Amino acid sequence: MRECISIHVGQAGVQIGNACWELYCLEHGIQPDGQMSFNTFFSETGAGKHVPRAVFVDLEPTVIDEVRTGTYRQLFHPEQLITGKEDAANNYARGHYTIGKEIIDLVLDRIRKLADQCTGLQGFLVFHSFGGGTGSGFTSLLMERLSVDYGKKSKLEFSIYPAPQVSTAVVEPYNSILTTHTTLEHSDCAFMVDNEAIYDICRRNLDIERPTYTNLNRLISQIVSSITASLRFDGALNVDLTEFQTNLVPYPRIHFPLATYAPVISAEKAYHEQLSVAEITNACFEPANQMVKCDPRHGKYMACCLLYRGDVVPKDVNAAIATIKTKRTIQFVDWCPTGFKVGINYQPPTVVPGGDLAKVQRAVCMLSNTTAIAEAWARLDHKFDLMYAKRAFVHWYVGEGMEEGEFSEAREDMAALEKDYEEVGV
């Protein structure tokens, strides 16, 4: 079978992971115990127990220690959960050059073992953060190694991007840029979600006034379930990981699709609602519902994909799409007329006990590229330029096996990227 590999890197990655493996289990029908074709995300053990086909890495042992004591604990064989000595401490030069070039080799080992299991290894998913220390250098390093090993294999990147406003960490801007330098030339596709937009979605659509990391994460994870379920499940028009890459990368360089997972509807909002197929399409295209702090109207959707689930019938979808094409507001690129692929899967999303969402019969994760993400790039370039004018926090990185020139080249790359998007828009 088509079968996959998970790699959670950094605190964010693992925290996202904790949410993810809950979901999959609830869907495939696996208990936390591992007891009960899920081949893609669960590899069956000798008898009864199923083992997640995952890798869990962090330099900060704090995080994965929480994993080892949670109810989701016995689900994973502790072959997976790797530990490092000391945290990357929001240094890219510790994630890459120092603590990375130590524990990386152990991780490469676990990866290889897991790869051996897979008959048909489809590809990889890399939950990291552009803007944690771990996931900024280490992720890049890991990616590099995997590219050298496999090359042809599918690689995917659920990247917690810096929110232009919201604040976690002072050096956050430097990390992103170093990551981008290295990431973009490995990962064939990169779905990037910033937390602020997710928070917006939490407050407005679900009426939740206390958005915890947990809730914000469940939403992110439901984005990934839809992307998979085409692999994981039966149905007309089934999409593959390779299909996205092929669909949603108009030029081989630019591959940064945004993601929106509608409906995002609470226990109340279930009633006062009827949840039609075409309702949910409109919702997806909503400027507010984007899982980035980007307005899609400030450019042109280059090429879009929609992954309907549950009780979705094709024509209905096809009519909604007609409507969408009709609206001249929602700008498309001149040069490719039909900018959709539709995948319809008989499996509906199944929602986590004690969570945000209620049973939505129909749902859709729209993974849409736009030239409009060029706005979030520019912002970040600016933040970095401002701090690199003073050369602040320079000392930390340099003394950890880095180049000052690497900072300059990274910006150059960003300029090139921005230029490319401009070209495409024209």
Binding site: V394, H395, V398, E404, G405
Partner: protein, 149 residues
Amino acid sequence: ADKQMSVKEDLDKVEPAVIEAQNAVKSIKKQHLVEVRSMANPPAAVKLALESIALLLGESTTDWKQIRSIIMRENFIPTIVNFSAEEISDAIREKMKKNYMSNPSYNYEIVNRASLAAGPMVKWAIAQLNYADMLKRVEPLRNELQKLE
């Protein structure tokens, strides 16, 4: 009297070199020194750049854990101020010439790329190992000031 000024030309032809080499002393930031003092696992380029000045003072140790001690000490700053290669031995300078004429780090491009923390000091180290050359410019003609003068 014609040769009396040719032996006095040597201090004049090294005058642009000496002045610029001692201008690399003045072009020293206090913050840039301690960046090296706060650096624990440096680029291999900046590591060699301090090995350049390590044996200039006369420390044969090459480990970074052990060489950061000379950098760490407070003796390190005033010694860079008053420093002259005129009094620096030829033999040790020869070691400074042999090792550092092979360096990628001696190329003013590698250091600058690595860091601007090591930038002006390699710019000093090129000037200061070329102050050794100024010593090797003046001294093979100083003998002319001892016998021919």
